[PDB]
Amino acid sequence: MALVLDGRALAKQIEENLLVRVEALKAKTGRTPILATILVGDDGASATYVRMKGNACRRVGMDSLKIELPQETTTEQLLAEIEKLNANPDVHGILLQHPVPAQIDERACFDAISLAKDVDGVTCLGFGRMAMGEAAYGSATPAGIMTILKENNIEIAGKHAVVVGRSAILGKPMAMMLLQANATVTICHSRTQNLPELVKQADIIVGAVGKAELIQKDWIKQGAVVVDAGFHPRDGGGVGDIQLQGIEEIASAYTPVPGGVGPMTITTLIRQTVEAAEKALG
Amino acid sequence: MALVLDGRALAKQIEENLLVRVEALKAKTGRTPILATILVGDDGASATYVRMKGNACRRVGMDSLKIELPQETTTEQLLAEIEKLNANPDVHGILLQHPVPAQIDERACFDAISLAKDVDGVTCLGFGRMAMGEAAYGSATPAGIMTILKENNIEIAGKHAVVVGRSAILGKPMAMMLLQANATVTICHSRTQNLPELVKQADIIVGAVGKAELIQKDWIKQGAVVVDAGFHPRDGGGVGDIQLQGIEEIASAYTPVPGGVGPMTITTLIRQTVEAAEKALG
Numbered sequence: 001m002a003l004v005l006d007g008r009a010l011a012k013q014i015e016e017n018l019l020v021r022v023e024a025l026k027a028k029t030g031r032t033p034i035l036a037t038i039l040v041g042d043d044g045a046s047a048t049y050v051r052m053k054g055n056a057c058r059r060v061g062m063d064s065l066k067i068e069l070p071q072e073t074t075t076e077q078l079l080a081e082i083e084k085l086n087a088n089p090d091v092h093g094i095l096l097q098h099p100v101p102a103q104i105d106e107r108a109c110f111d112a113i114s115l116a117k118d119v120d121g122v123t124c125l126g127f128g129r130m131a132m133g134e135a136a137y138g139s140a141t142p143a144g145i146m147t148i149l150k151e152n153n154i155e156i157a158g159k160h161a162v163v164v165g166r167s168a169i170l171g172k173p174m175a176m177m178l179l180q181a182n183a184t185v186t187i188c189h190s191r192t193q194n195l196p197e198l199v200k201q202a203d204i205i206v207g208a209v210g211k212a213e214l215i216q217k218d219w220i221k222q223g224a225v226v227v228d229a230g231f232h233p234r235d236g237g238g239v240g241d242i243q244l245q246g247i248e249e250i251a252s253a254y255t256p257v258p259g260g261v262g263p264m265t266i267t268t269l270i271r272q273t274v275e276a277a278e279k280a281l282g
Numbered sequence: 283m284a285l286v287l288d289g290r291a292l293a294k295q296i297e298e299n300l301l302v303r304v305e306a307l308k309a310k311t312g313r314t315p316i317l318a319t320i321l322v323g324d325d326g327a328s329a330t331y332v333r334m335k336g337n338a339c340r341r342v343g344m345d346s347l348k349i350e351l352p353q354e355t356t357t358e359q360l361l362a363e364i365e366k367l368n369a370n371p372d373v374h375g376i377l378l379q380h381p382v383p384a385q386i387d388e389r390a391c392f393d394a395i396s397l398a399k400d401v402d403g404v405t406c407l408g409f410g411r412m413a414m415g416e417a418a419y420g421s422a423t424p425a426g427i428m429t430i431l432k433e434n435n436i437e438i439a440g441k442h443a444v445v446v447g448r449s450a451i452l453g454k455p456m457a458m459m460l461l462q463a464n465a466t467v468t469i470c471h472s473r474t475q476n477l478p479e480l481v482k483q484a485d486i487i488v489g490a491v492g493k494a495e496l497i498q499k500d501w502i503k504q505g506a507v508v509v510d511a512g513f514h515p516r517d518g519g520g521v522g523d524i525q526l527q528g529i530e531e532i533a534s535a536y537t538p539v540p541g542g543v544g545p546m547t548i549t550t551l552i553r554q555t556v557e558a559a560e561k562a563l564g
């Protein structure tokens with residue numbers, strides 16, 4: 001049977017280390033690390049993930065500054081809020097939960113976040129630096145995925161990694177991170193032809209399409225490493241972007257859904273915020 | 283049978299209106315657009331390419347500011363020179379010819395160039411912005427290749443593009459630009475295990491390895507679009523990264539070497555300099 005890539009376990013483990021680090025920092029400086037979380041509008045999943053990220057902050061001994069803005073917020077209004085957080089020395093990281101209301105230029109607002117506080121890794125600057133091997137906080141989910149792979153001793157160098165999806169915060173950074181780790185990388189999307197064949201060639205497959213079980217189990221190469229970055233709620237167990245039923249007979253290793261990529265998304269954000277606080281308060 | 287993708291003819295065509303634009307800007311403002319070229323050390327090819335770029339500037343009514351620094355220039359020294367040029371209002375674009383001497387952190391120096399003057403498209407910020415679809419000067423060679431494909435009506439959307447090579451100024455930006463044009467993109471490099479297999483599936487193949495005729499003609503798909511971004515001088519006619527002798531029997535369209543990608547590398551830099559000058563002066 002396939003190795004279960006246990007992101008839930010790894011997240012908890014990482015948080016135990018973060019906790020002692022945060023407590024040491026507070027004891028030395030008297031100051032608490034702070035993630036500013038920006039939630040714009042009433043999207044349910046967005047509310048949930050910000051809630052979970054706030055919880056993660058408190059588990060490791062830090063806190064969050066919760067910024068809640070109405071659905072009708074303008075790009076200019078959100079930019080003003082982000083600049084207030086940039087200029088606040090008490091705020092160490094800034095999260096803008098995506099997707100913001102569609103009238104807002106989300107890209108412009110991402111890029112307004114100062115690099116030093118880009119702990120979710122959403123800036124063009126941060127992306128470009130990461131792609132070219134320079135120090136920068138990585139996009140939360142992709143960086144979480146790399147950590148899962150690394151800490152489970154998964155071979156990446158020389159493997160053919162197929163990333164299905166090319167989103168700004170997930171697919172694109174994932175591809176560039178795998179490339180930096182010396183995988184041959186294929187990037188697919190909605191205009192990709194022969195997707196089943198490309199997926200079948202993959203030694204490592206990353207489902208990042210935001211559509212329930214789009215990647216079919218019979219497309220998966222026998223022995224492949226299967227990363228499912230999706231989540232779609234359902235009665236009696238939610239599912240991701242990949243058909244994972246019976247995956248244990250097919251993959252060499254796989255991330256379960258729930259409890260795989262998800263927990264490591266949140267914990268990666270918090271770890272990078274601790275790093276930012278450690279730097280800022282050191 | 284193949285369509286020759288004539289970069290030399292396209293470069294000449296494009297310069298016609300660039301000259302009109304520059305002469306209009308000069309007549310209107312009384313100021314001459316300047317590209318600052320930085321040549322560090324004794325690389326013969328670098329010197330040759332810098333002169334070609336200086337010549338190209340002058341062909342369209344602009345001028346160059348020739349910065350020549352010694353072989354043993356340090357990172358600190360180069361950075362200081364770039365900051366002088368950033369703060370020079372008479373300089374509208376900055377080129378740092380690669381590869382600088384080994385002791386210099388080239389990435390750090392590329393990134394010191396102000397985005398507004400990054401007309402060669404070498405900054406991490408420029409790369410990330412391009413990758414995320416924000417307006418930015420693109421890396422000269424890749425952007426030139428996209429122009430060649432567009433001007434020759436080459437279908438990109440939905441094609442399987444394979445880019446062999448992943449360098450900062452060529453392979454990586456090439457990959458993202460093709461991705462932006464809705465190709466499915468596979469990025470190969472020195473740790474790719476079955477390079478011939480992958481090249482054989484390429485609808486569009488980009489040779490960006492810097493090794494004479496490494497990409498074999500036997501690997502090319504019948505009807506492929508073939509882009510050779512290499513140049514290696516030989517007695518009575520240099521060769522690129524791809525075996526092109528007899529390529530006309532196999533490719534639907536191909537870039538000759540010489541006279542393909544090269545001319546459009548220079549034209550792209552000059553065009554983006556014209557753009558920078560117009561923005562700065564107009």
Ligand SMILES: Nc1nc(O)c2c(n1)NC[C@@H]1CN(c3ccc(C(=O)N[C@@H](CCC(=O)O)C(=O)O)cc3)C(=O)N21
Pocket residue numbers: 048049095096097098099120122140141169231257258259260261262263265266
């Ligand atoms: N800026 C920004 N950064 C992010 O990193 C995110 C963002 N926007 N918007 C959506 C994605 C998705 N996402 C996220 C985070 C955690 C989980 C997670 O842990 N999910 C559980 C199942 C419960 C559920 O998803 O509601 C899991 O075990 O996978 C899922 C998505 C998240 O946090 N994302």
Ligand SMILES: Nc1nc(O)c2c(n1)NC[C@@H]1CN(c3ccc(C(=O)N[C@@H](CCC(=O)O)C(=O)O)cc3)C(=O)N21
Pocket residue numbers: 330331377378379380381402404422423451513539540541542543544545547548
């Ligand atoms: N920063 C930076 N930007 C660039 O855009 C370049 C750089 N460094 N260093 C090397 C590459 C390669 N390069 C370049 C430019 C023009 C030509 C060219 O036009 N070559 C002729 C043949 C003559 C020859 O190559 O000596 C051709 O028709 O291809 C070849 C490489 C160039 O300008 N490059």
Ligand SMILES: [Cl-]
Pocket residue numbers: 337338341
């Ligand atoms: Cl001339």
